[PDB]
Amino acid sequence: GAFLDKPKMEKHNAQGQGNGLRYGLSSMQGWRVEMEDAHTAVIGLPSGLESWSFFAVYDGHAGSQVAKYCCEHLLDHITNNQDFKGSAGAPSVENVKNGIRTGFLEIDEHMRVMSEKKHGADRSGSTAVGVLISPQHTYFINCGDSRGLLCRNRKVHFFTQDHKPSNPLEKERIQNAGGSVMIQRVNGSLAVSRALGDFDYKCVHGKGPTEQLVSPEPEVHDIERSEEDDQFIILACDGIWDVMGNEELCDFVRSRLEVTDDLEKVCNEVVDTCLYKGSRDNMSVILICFPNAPKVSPEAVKKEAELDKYLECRVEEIIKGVPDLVHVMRTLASENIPSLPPGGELASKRNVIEAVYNRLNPY
Ligand SMILES: [Mn+2]
Ligand SMILES: [Mn+2]
């Protein structure tokens, strides 16, 4: 159980475009000794689902094996089961909703036999959150305390409910399986009540797969798509949500979008803003934009240039002693500066403040 001396801030990104979608993503190790986050991003799906897309963030615990496996294989376990292909024509809401349940339980069990057969030593587990997007529906999927949300019409239209042990239904299940919730943890150890893997928590004799201490059962929500009102979707692991709320991040992402159409950069900003707000976990963000996502605005760009220039002068004028960056940040915060990005605050502006500090105090 360890942190690094200094955070690994190297971004891993991806992007793509298709089916009237644009997407960006950013993943960062941060203060943690390991990177155990994984993700999927694919526009255009096999077997006659060309117009479908799928995205997901996977937050691994006690190693990355479960996450990494899910990130390569969860999609086919979901679409290649009889429940997903039940009816004859294109799959229905129930086909999709059940297909995901079956796909989740079947990959979990599949990993359990692989781990048994090969004598595997890892005792890892993983959250999953994502959307499966059809020409007319966004199907949110959640299993764990990773979280996604839909921004529609400038507002938080929907978000996923984190599976926490102390949530009433999860508490009920955990107790009926002969465990308890201590403070916020399953038997005082595990911070999530749902996850793939974690097989040591799925050994309760004579209880179903979905009635163990930790369930792999997903929660699925069908939201009907809205060409006119749908703006963007954020998926991210708990490393983000720990330090930003739904509305905030939603307002922040908007404010960034009005400045770039570069989505990897928007995801970098979210991730950095969070590290600077105190987050010490691995972080991974996916941003998927619909055609009526916020547009780059000339005025917004100008306002950011003006703010940036202002922040640069404030840094120099403060330097006059020679205070360190931590102290300059302190002074700047005490100045109560207007027009900082919404949700992001001073933290979302540290990269500008620090490059300036470095220009003026390089040694
Ligand atoms: Mn993790
Ligand atoms: Mn995490």
mmCIF file with all atom_site columns, C-alpha atoms in Angstrom, residues 93-242:
data_model
loop_
_atom_site.group_PDB
_atom_site.id
_atom_site.type_symbol
_atom_site.label_atom_id
_atom_site.label_alt_id
_atom_site.label_comp_id
_atom_site.label_asym_id
_atom_site.label_entity_id
_atom_site.label_seq_id
_atom_site.pdbx_PDB_ins_code
_atom_site.Cartn_x
_atom_site.Cartn_y
_atom_site.Cartn_z
_atom_site.occupancy
_atom_site.B_iso_or_equiv
_atom_site.pdbx_formal_charge
_atom_site.auth_seq_id
_atom_site.auth_comp_id
_atom_site.auth_asym_id
_atom_site.auth_atom_id
_atom_site.pdbx_PDB_model_num
ATOM 1   C CA . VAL A 1 93  ? -35.123 -2.743  -25.061 1.00 0.00 ? 93  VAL A CA 1
ATOM 2   C CA . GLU A 1 94  ? -35.524 -5.992  -23.078 1.00 0.00 ? 94  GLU A CA 1
ATOM 3   C CA . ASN A 1 95  ? -33.033 -7.814  -25.356 1.00 0.00 ? 95  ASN A CA 1
ATOM 4   C CA . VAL A 1 96  ? -30.514 -5.055  -24.716 1.00 0.00 ? 96  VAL A CA 1
ATOM 5   C CA . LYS A 1 97  ? -31.265 -4.763  -20.976 1.00 0.00 ? 97  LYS A CA 1
ATOM 6   C CA . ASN A 1 98  ? -31.095 -8.575  -20.473 1.00 0.00 ? 98  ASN A CA 1
ATOM 7   C CA . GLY A 1 99  ? -28.193 -9.065  -22.891 1.00 0.00 ? 99  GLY A CA 1
ATOM 8   C CA . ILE A 1 100 ? -26.098 -6.814  -20.630 1.00 0.00 ? 100 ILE A CA 1
ATOM 9   C CA . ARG A 1 101 ? -27.149 -8.655  -17.460 1.00 0.00 ? 101 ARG A CA 1
ATOM 10  C CA . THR A 1 102 ? -26.220 -12.021 -19.045 1.00 0.00 ? 102 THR A CA 1
ATOM 11  C CA . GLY A 1 103 ? -22.997 -10.638 -20.516 1.00 0.00 ? 103 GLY A CA 1
ATOM 12  C CA . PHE A 1 104 ? -21.906 -9.316  -17.118 1.00 0.00 ? 104 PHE A CA 1
ATOM 13  C CA . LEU A 1 105 ? -22.642 -12.565 -15.236 1.00 0.00 ? 105 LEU A CA 1
ATOM 14  C CA . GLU A 1 106 ? -21.156 -14.733 -18.000 1.00 0.00 ? 106 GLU A CA 1
ATOM 15  C CA . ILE A 1 107 ? -17.830 -12.880 -18.185 1.00 0.00 ? 107 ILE A CA 1
ATOM 16  C CA . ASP A 1 108 ? -17.569 -12.976 -14.346 1.00 0.00 ? 108 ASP A CA 1
ATOM 17  C CA . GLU A 1 109 ? -18.079 -16.754 -14.280 1.00 0.00 ? 109 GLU A CA 1
ATOM 18  C CA . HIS A 1 110 ? -15.816 -17.142 -17.331 1.00 0.00 ? 110 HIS A CA 1
ATOM 19  C CA . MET A 1 111 ? -13.045 -15.355 -15.434 1.00 0.00 ? 111 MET A CA 1
ATOM 20  C CA . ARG A 1 112 ? -13.695 -17.567 -12.419 1.00 0.00 ? 112 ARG A CA 1
ATOM 21  C CA . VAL A 1 113 ? -13.141 -20.799 -14.409 1.00 0.00 ? 113 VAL A CA 1
ATOM 22  C CA . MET A 1 114 ? -10.031 -19.319 -16.120 1.00 0.00 ? 114 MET A CA 1
ATOM 23  C CA . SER A 1 115 ? -8.632  -18.292 -12.738 1.00 0.00 ? 115 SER A CA 1
ATOM 24  C CA . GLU A 1 116 ? -9.387  -21.748 -11.334 1.00 0.00 ? 116 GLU A CA 1
ATOM 25  C CA . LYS A 1 117 ? -8.032  -23.685 -14.335 1.00 0.00 ? 117 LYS A CA 1
ATOM 26  C CA . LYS A 1 118 ? -4.769  -21.687 -14.596 1.00 0.00 ? 118 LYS A CA 1
ATOM 27  C CA . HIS A 1 119 ? -4.083  -21.485 -10.810 1.00 0.00 ? 119 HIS A CA 1
ATOM 28  C CA . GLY A 1 120 ? -4.091  -17.648 -10.963 1.00 0.00 ? 120 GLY A CA 1
ATOM 29  C CA . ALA A 1 121 ? -2.746  -15.690 -8.029  1.00 0.00 ? 121 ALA A CA 1
ATOM 30  C CA . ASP A 1 122 ? -4.197  -12.217 -8.491  1.00 0.00 ? 122 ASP A CA 1
ATOM 31  C CA . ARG A 1 123 ? -7.167  -11.398 -6.316  1.00 0.00 ? 123 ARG A CA 1
ATOM 32  C CA . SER A 1 124 ? -8.260  -8.420  -8.412  1.00 0.00 ? 124 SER A CA 1
ATOM 33  C CA . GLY A 1 125 ? -11.717 -6.935  -9.183  1.00 0.00 ? 125 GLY A CA 1
ATOM 34  C CA . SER A 1 126 ? -13.152 -4.095  -11.299 1.00 0.00 ? 126 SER A CA 1
ATOM 35  C CA . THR A 1 127 ? -15.921 -1.533  -11.615 1.00 0.00 ? 127 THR A CA 1
ATOM 36  C CA . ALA A 1 128 ? -17.612 -1.022  -14.963 1.00 0.00 ? 128 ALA A CA 1
ATOM 37  C CA . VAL A 1 129 ? -19.497 2.006   -16.213 1.00 0.00 ? 129 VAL A CA 1
ATOM 38  C CA . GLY A 1 130 ? -20.466 2.803   -19.796 1.00 0.00 ? 130 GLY A CA 1
ATOM 39  C CA . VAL A 1 131 ? -23.030 3.516   -22.480 1.00 0.00 ? 131 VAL A CA 1
ATOM 40  C CA . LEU A 1 132 ? -24.127 1.359   -25.354 1.00 0.00 ? 132 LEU A CA 1
ATOM 41  C CA . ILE A 1 133 ? -25.478 3.816   -27.959 1.00 0.00 ? 133 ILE A CA 1
ATOM 42  C CA . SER A 1 134 ? -28.066 2.875   -30.589 1.00 0.00 ? 134 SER A CA 1
ATOM 43  C CA . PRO A 1 135 ? -29.482 5.160   -33.308 1.00 0.00 ? 135 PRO A CA 1
ATOM 44  C CA . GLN A 1 136 ? -32.338 5.928   -30.853 1.00 0.00 ? 136 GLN A CA 1
ATOM 45  C CA . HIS A 1 137 ? -31.260 5.026   -27.297 1.00 0.00 ? 137 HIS A CA 1
ATOM 46  C CA . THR A 1 138 ? -28.450 5.600   -24.862 1.00 0.00 ? 138 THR A CA 1
ATOM 47  C CA . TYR A 1 139 ? -28.243 2.647   -22.509 1.00 0.00 ? 139 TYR A CA 1
ATOM 48  C CA . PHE A 1 140 ? -26.323 3.533   -19.388 1.00 0.00 ? 140 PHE A CA 1
ATOM 49  C CA . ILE A 1 141 ? -24.623 0.601   -17.693 1.00 0.00 ? 141 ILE A CA 1
ATOM 50  C CA . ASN A 1 142 ? -23.218 0.663   -14.115 1.00 0.00 ? 142 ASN A CA 1
ATOM 51  C CA . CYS A 1 143 ? -21.560 -1.808  -11.757 1.00 0.00 ? 143 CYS A CA 1
ATOM 52  C CA . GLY A 1 144 ? -19.515 -0.163  -8.994  1.00 0.00 ? 144 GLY A CA 1
ATOM 53  C CA . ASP A 1 145 ? -18.624 3.390   -7.935  1.00 0.00 ? 145 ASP A CA 1
ATOM 54  C CA . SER A 1 146 ? -17.355 4.558   -11.309 1.00 0.00 ? 146 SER A CA 1
ATOM 55  C CA . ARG A 1 147 ? -20.003 6.956   -12.719 1.00 0.00 ? 147 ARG A CA 1
ATOM 56  C CA . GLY A 1 148 ? -21.330 8.369   -15.977 1.00 0.00 ? 148 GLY A CA 1
ATOM 57  C CA . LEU A 1 149 ? -23.759 11.148  -16.836 1.00 0.00 ? 149 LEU A CA 1
ATOM 58  C CA . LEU A 1 150 ? -25.700 12.684  -19.685 1.00 0.00 ? 150 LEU A CA 1
ATOM 59  C CA . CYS A 1 151 ? -25.721 16.386  -20.283 1.00 0.00 ? 151 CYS A CA 1
ATOM 60  C CA . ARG A 1 152 ? -28.869 17.384  -22.135 1.00 0.00 ? 152 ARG A CA 1
ATOM 61  C CA . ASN A 1 153 ? -30.000 20.957  -22.734 1.00 0.00 ? 153 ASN A CA 1
ATOM 62  C CA . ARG A 1 154 ? -27.187 22.447  -20.604 1.00 0.00 ? 154 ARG A CA 1
ATOM 63  C CA . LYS A 1 155 ? -28.441 20.415  -17.594 1.00 0.00 ? 155 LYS A CA 1
ATOM 64  C CA . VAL A 1 156 ? -27.678 17.075  -15.839 1.00 0.00 ? 156 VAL A CA 1
ATOM 65  C CA . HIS A 1 157 ? -30.356 14.939  -17.501 1.00 0.00 ? 157 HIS A CA 1
ATOM 66  C CA . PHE A 1 158 ? -29.238 11.652  -15.954 1.00 0.00 ? 158 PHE A CA 1
ATOM 67  C CA . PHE A 1 159 ? -26.402 10.166  -13.839 1.00 0.00 ? 159 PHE A CA 1
ATOM 68  C CA . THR A 1 160 ? -25.600 6.664   -12.547 1.00 0.00 ? 160 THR A CA 1
ATOM 69  C CA . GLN A 1 161 ? -26.097 5.738   -8.856  1.00 0.00 ? 161 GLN A CA 1
ATOM 70  C CA . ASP A 1 162 ? -22.879 4.412   -7.328  1.00 0.00 ? 162 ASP A CA 1
ATOM 71  C CA . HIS A 1 163 ? -23.137 0.986   -5.755  1.00 0.00 ? 163 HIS A CA 1
ATOM 72  C CA . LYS A 1 164 ? -21.980 1.597   -2.199  1.00 0.00 ? 164 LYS A CA 1
ATOM 73  C CA . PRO A 1 165 ? -22.101 -1.113  0.530   1.00 0.00 ? 165 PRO A CA 1
ATOM 74  C CA . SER A 1 166 ? -24.178 1.144   2.824   1.00 0.00 ? 166 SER A CA 1
ATOM 75  C CA . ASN A 1 167 ? -26.872 1.738   0.190   1.00 0.00 ? 167 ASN A CA 1
ATOM 76  C CA . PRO A 1 168 ? -30.018 0.041   1.728   1.00 0.00 ? 168 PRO A CA 1
ATOM 77  C CA . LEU A 1 169 ? -30.433 -2.786  -0.812  1.00 0.00 ? 169 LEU A CA 1
ATOM 78  C CA . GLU A 1 170 ? -26.750 -3.663  -0.944  1.00 0.00 ? 170 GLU A CA 1
ATOM 79  C CA . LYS A 1 171 ? -26.596 -3.665  2.872   1.00 0.00 ? 171 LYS A CA 1
ATOM 80  C CA . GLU A 1 172 ? -29.542 -6.079  2.826   1.00 0.00 ? 172 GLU A CA 1
ATOM 81  C CA . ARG A 1 173 ? -27.852 -8.475  0.356   1.00 0.00 ? 173 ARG A CA 1
ATOM 82  C CA . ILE A 1 174 ? -24.429 -8.352  2.090   1.00 0.00 ? 174 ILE A CA 1
ATOM 83  C CA . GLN A 1 175 ? -26.126 -9.210  5.424   1.00 0.00 ? 175 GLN A CA 1
ATOM 84  C CA . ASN A 1 176 ? -28.196 -12.040 3.932   1.00 0.00 ? 176 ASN A CA 1
ATOM 85  C CA . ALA A 1 177 ? -24.934 -13.503 2.604   1.00 0.00 ? 177 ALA A CA 1
ATOM 86  C CA . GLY A 1 178 ? -23.528 -13.589 6.155   1.00 0.00 ? 178 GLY A CA 1
ATOM 87  C CA . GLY A 1 179 ? -21.350 -10.474 6.025   1.00 0.00 ? 179 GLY A CA 1
ATOM 88  C CA . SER A 1 180 ? -21.846 -6.952  7.341   1.00 0.00 ? 180 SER A CA 1
ATOM 89  C CA . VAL A 1 181 ? -21.146 -3.325  6.357   1.00 0.00 ? 181 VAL A CA 1
ATOM 90  C CA . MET A 1 182 ? -18.636 -1.687  8.659   1.00 0.00 ? 182 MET A CA 1
ATOM 91  C CA . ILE A 1 183 ? -18.718 2.061   8.243   1.00 0.00 ? 183 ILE A CA 1
ATOM 92  C CA . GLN A 1 184 ? -18.615 2.034   4.417   1.00 0.00 ? 184 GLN A CA 1
ATOM 93  C CA . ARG A 1 185 ? -16.965 -1.298  3.728   1.00 0.00 ? 185 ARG A CA 1
ATOM 94  C CA . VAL A 1 186 ? -17.936 -4.922  3.027   1.00 0.00 ? 186 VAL A CA 1
ATOM 95  C CA . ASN A 1 187 ? -16.708 -6.851  6.103   1.00 0.00 ? 187 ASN A CA 1
ATOM 96  C CA . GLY A 1 188 ? -14.683 -3.701  6.830   1.00 0.00 ? 188 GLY A CA 1
ATOM 97  C CA . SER A 1 189 ? -12.466 -4.101  3.708   1.00 0.00 ? 189 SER A CA 1
ATOM 98  C CA . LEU A 1 190 ? -14.099 -3.591  0.323   1.00 0.00 ? 190 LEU A CA 1
ATOM 99  C CA . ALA A 1 191 ? -15.306 -0.090  -0.673  1.00 0.00 ? 191 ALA A CA 1
ATOM 100 C CA . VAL A 1 192 ? -17.768 -1.266  -3.412  1.00 0.00 ? 192 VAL A CA 1
ATOM 101 C CA . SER A 1 193 ? -20.757 -3.582  -3.231  1.00 0.00 ? 193 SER A CA 1
ATOM 102 C CA . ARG A 1 194 ? -20.698 -4.485  -6.944  1.00 0.00 ? 194 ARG A CA 1
ATOM 103 C CA . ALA A 1 195 ? -17.857 -5.519  -9.264  1.00 0.00 ? 195 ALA A CA 1
ATOM 104 C CA . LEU A 1 196 ? -16.521 -8.129  -11.637 1.00 0.00 ? 196 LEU A CA 1
ATOM 105 C CA . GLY A 1 197 ? -13.845 -10.401 -10.132 1.00 0.00 ? 197 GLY A CA 1
ATOM 106 C CA . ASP A 1 198 ? -13.387 -10.285 -6.339  1.00 0.00 ? 198 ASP A CA 1
ATOM 107 C CA . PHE A 1 199 ? -14.046 -14.005 -6.310  1.00 0.00 ? 199 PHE A CA 1
ATOM 108 C CA . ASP A 1 200 ? -13.111 -14.352 -2.589  1.00 0.00 ? 200 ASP A CA 1
ATOM 109 C CA . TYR A 1 201 ? -16.345 -12.429 -2.018  1.00 0.00 ? 201 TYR A CA 1
ATOM 110 C CA . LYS A 1 202 ? -18.423 -14.742 -4.168  1.00 0.00 ? 202 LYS A CA 1
ATOM 111 C CA . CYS A 1 203 ? -17.991 -17.994 -2.205  1.00 0.00 ? 203 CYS A CA 1
ATOM 112 C CA . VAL A 1 204 ? -21.190 -17.988 -0.139  1.00 0.00 ? 204 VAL A CA 1
ATOM 113 C CA . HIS A 1 205 ? -22.512 -21.523 -0.264  1.00 0.00 ? 205 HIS A CA 1
ATOM 114 C CA . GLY A 1 206 ? -26.062 -21.928 -1.620  1.00 0.00 ? 206 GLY A CA 1
ATOM 115 C CA . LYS A 1 207 ? -26.762 -18.376 -2.782  1.00 0.00 ? 207 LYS A CA 1
ATOM 116 C CA . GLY A 1 208 ? -27.113 -17.246 -6.397  1.00 0.00 ? 208 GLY A CA 1
ATOM 117 C CA . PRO A 1 209 ? -24.455 -15.299 -8.367  1.00 0.00 ? 209 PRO A CA 1
ATOM 118 C CA . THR A 1 210 ? -26.383 -12.090 -7.644  1.00 0.00 ? 210 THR A CA 1
ATOM 119 C CA . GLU A 1 211 ? -26.862 -12.814 -3.924  1.00 0.00 ? 211 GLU A CA 1
ATOM 120 C CA . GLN A 1 212 ? -23.212 -12.928 -2.812  1.00 0.00 ? 212 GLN A CA 1
ATOM 121 C CA . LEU A 1 213 ? -21.288 -10.345 -0.751  1.00 0.00 ? 213 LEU A CA 1
ATOM 122 C CA . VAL A 1 214 ? -20.272 -8.578  -4.026  1.00 0.00 ? 214 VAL A CA 1
ATOM 123 C CA . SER A 1 215 ? -22.630 -8.757  -6.993  1.00 0.00 ? 215 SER A CA 1
ATOM 124 C CA . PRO A 1 216 ? -21.609 -8.570  -10.665 1.00 0.00 ? 216 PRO A CA 1
ATOM 125 C CA . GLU A 1 217 ? -25.184 -7.550  -11.564 1.00 0.00 ? 217 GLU A CA 1
ATOM 126 C CA . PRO A 1 218 ? -25.245 -4.375  -13.709 1.00 0.00 ? 218 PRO A CA 1
ATOM 127 C CA . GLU A 1 219 ? -27.778 -1.586  -13.540 1.00 0.00 ? 219 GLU A CA 1
ATOM 128 C CA . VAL A 1 220 ? -29.085 -0.562  -16.983 1.00 0.00 ? 220 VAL A CA 1
ATOM 129 C CA . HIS A 1 221 ? -31.023 2.552   -17.957 1.00 0.00 ? 221 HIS A CA 1
ATOM 130 C CA . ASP A 1 222 ? -32.674 3.150   -21.302 1.00 0.00 ? 222 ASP A CA 1
ATOM 131 C CA . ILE A 1 223 ? -32.722 6.849   -22.194 1.00 0.00 ? 223 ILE A CA 1
ATOM 132 C CA . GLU A 1 224 ? -34.432 7.798   -25.463 1.00 0.00 ? 224 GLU A CA 1
ATOM 133 C CA . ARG A 1 225 ? -32.110 9.841   -27.612 1.00 0.00 ? 225 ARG A CA 1
ATOM 134 C CA . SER A 1 226 ? -32.809 13.446  -28.481 1.00 0.00 ? 226 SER A CA 1
ATOM 135 C CA . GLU A 1 227 ? -31.059 14.774  -31.636 1.00 0.00 ? 227 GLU A CA 1
ATOM 136 C CA . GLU A 1 228 ? -31.981 18.361  -30.670 1.00 0.00 ? 228 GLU A CA 1
ATOM 137 C CA . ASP A 1 229 ? -31.192 18.313  -26.916 1.00 0.00 ? 229 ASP A CA 1
ATOM 138 C CA . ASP A 1 230 ? -28.428 15.722  -26.278 1.00 0.00 ? 230 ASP A CA 1
ATOM 139 C CA . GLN A 1 231 ? -25.067 17.474  -25.699 1.00 0.00 ? 231 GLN A CA 1
ATOM 140 C CA . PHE A 1 232 ? -22.419 15.164  -24.201 1.00 0.00 ? 232 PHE A CA 1
ATOM 141 C CA . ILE A 1 233 ? -21.771 12.167  -21.938 1.00 0.00 ? 233 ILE A CA 1
ATOM 142 C CA . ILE A 1 234 ? -19.057 11.898  -19.278 1.00 0.00 ? 234 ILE A CA 1
ATOM 143 C CA . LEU A 1 235 ? -17.844 8.556   -17.995 1.00 0.00 ? 235 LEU A CA 1
ATOM 144 C CA . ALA A 1 236 ? -15.124 8.482   -15.319 1.00 0.00 ? 236 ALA A CA 1
ATOM 145 C CA . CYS A 1 237 ? -13.832 6.413   -12.409 1.00 0.00 ? 237 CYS A CA 1
ATOM 146 C CA . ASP A 1 238 ? -14.085 7.515   -8.744  1.00 0.00 ? 238 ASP A CA 1
ATOM 147 C CA . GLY A 1 239 ? -10.732 9.364   -9.001  1.00 0.00 ? 239 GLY A CA 1
ATOM 148 C CA . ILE A 1 240 ? -12.639 12.178  -10.748 1.00 0.00 ? 240 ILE A CA 1
ATOM 149 C CA . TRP A 1 241 ? -15.976 12.118  -8.843  1.00 0.00 ? 241 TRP A CA 1
ATOM 150 C CA . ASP A 1 242 ? -14.225 12.155  -5.447  1.00 0.00 ? 242 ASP A CA 1
#
